[PDB]
Swiss-Prot record, chain B:
EC number per UniProt: 4.2.3.146
Gene3D superfamilies: Farnesyl Diphosphate Synthase
Name of encoding gene: CotB2
Function description: Catalyzes the cyclization of the linear isoprenoid intermediate geranylgeranyl diphosphate to tricycclic cyclooctat-9-en-7-ol in the cyclooctatin biosynthesis pathway. Cyclooctatin is a potent inhibitor of lysophospholipase.
Top-rank lineage group of the source organism: Bacteria
Signal peptide: none
Substitution effect: residue 98 to E: Abolishes activity, no product
Coiled coil stretches, renumbered: none
Designated name of the protein: Cyclooctat-9-en-7-ol synthase
Amino acid sequence: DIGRSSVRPYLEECTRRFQEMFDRHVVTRPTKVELTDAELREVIDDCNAAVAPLGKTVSDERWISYVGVVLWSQSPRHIKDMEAFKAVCVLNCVTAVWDDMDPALHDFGLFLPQLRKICEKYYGPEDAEVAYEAARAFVTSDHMFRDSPIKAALCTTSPEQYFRFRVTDIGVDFWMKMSYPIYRHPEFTEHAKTSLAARMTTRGLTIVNDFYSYDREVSLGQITNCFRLCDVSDETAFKEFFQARLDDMIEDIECIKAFDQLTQDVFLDLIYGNFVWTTSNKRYKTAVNDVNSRIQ
Amino acid sequence: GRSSVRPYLEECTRRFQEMFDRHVVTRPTKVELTDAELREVIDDCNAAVAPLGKTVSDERWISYVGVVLWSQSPRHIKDMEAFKAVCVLNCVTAVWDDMDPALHDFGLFLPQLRKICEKYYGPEDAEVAYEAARAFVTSDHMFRDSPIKAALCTTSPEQYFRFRVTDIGVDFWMKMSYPIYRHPEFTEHAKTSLAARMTTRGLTIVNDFYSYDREVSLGQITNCFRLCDVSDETAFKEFFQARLDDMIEDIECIKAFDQLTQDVFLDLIYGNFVWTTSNKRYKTAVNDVNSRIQA
Ligand SMILES: [Cl-]
Ligand SMILES: [Cl-]
Ligand SMILES: [Mg+2]
Ligand SMILES: [Mg+2]
Ligand SMILES: [Mg+2]
Ligand SMILES: [Mg+2]
Ligand SMILES: [Mg+2]
Ligand SMILES: [Mg+2]
């Protein structure tokens, strides 16, 4: 019940502890990519050009709120392909719309060609297929698991089962497989394609997202959130659960430091940058305001 | 003696089997190949690894291929050409897994993997199977003397099994096996790698226990039982129970999948155990079936 329906009492302390953790384990700050107004407008118009078959209009402010994760969580010091950057901007945004849509509106025949059109505009032939398959797999997974028994089992059993589901469902495998062309770094490209890149970063992305999206998701009956494993109405059990998740994040980050310099740079900018964006998006500042729910 | 799980061999085998009978229930069935299929498979295996210069005996091929014969899901098979492809791809990449890396020639071996995939698979599936084979052999190579491998295999069971999702080859297996079944739900789980992540621990814990002696004699660190002091019967006992607990949890969550997919997942884990307990490979440290000869 409502005594369990929000993580608001822990908002300030957990935000502080998240930042404390990154300052002591990552150290290097994330950094915005600033697109021009023309580049931002190109991205947005391509976004509108992808969801228009599905019928709905999406405001500039909604697009800008979706695209911030790409602006904050890539690795600017290592970028070599700004066309691949813009592709990740568009692909991220249009599949976030899909993630927010009611499944009865998931028209694959109309939407999948639009995803391919994006990948072919921005990527070479081989990259286009890799980016497109991951986009296809991501939107199919989100459709697949709406009120699936599989999701219920994997989210309610253990943190191990839940994070295993999230390697795909949170979109990080997709992210890696559309982002390696930005960097054109051979080791990073191989970790992206084995999905080791996604598995190394899944928990740090997921735990942060789950904390700040918890209120919205429970109000909408969405079960894919690790803090639904613990009783968030008891401070003691919550704090103990939360420390376990910080420990998870720390172990991952320290193992990431065994990767080569450029690769760990990208991995860590992703995790820390997602945190910075997540704490500045109004999507995650009520259960249900007008920038995150709508309609069903 | 410190690198051997020999004192634990009988009890752990019994406990493994008891676990499967209780939690899986239905046993695996071994695929019978005719003489012509088996000779087609071995001929293509030899043709594929010939440019790497190391002869491989029929007996060695048969030892590699048994895992495919035992760990697929016979009552759901629809495409025996894809089945034969998995036989060949499994065996040739197992030889690669047993090669000194100085003999890894990607320029000679990668086109042999492509030629196998194009023979047995439709056009999309040949790409999916080829990429996963490429991913597997490249990973085995690039992690051979690697601080990344050291970190993931020494830190925690959690980091270890994360590396094994790729390293043991199960993601490869799923991406080349889905065409055998033509089951739409199974094909998607294969392509997201959820299939692989559900089955990794049950495959890895079994294989690790029985390949431990061989691996530590060859200086191979990719084995979860190197996380515990196998010379401490109390510490080993507690560790082994924790790994059984991991297998049980995975298996009970697999049962939430649709009936066919769950048959394929559980046949894979249990069939692998049945094959492993009768593979000669695992019966010495290094024997001249599974020798990767060196130095
Ligand atoms: Cl959900
Ligand atoms: Cl190894
Ligand atoms: Mg989602
Ligand atoms: Mg969502
Ligand atoms: Mg969320
Ligand atoms: Mg190996
Ligand atoms: Mg091996
Ligand atoms: Mg082994």
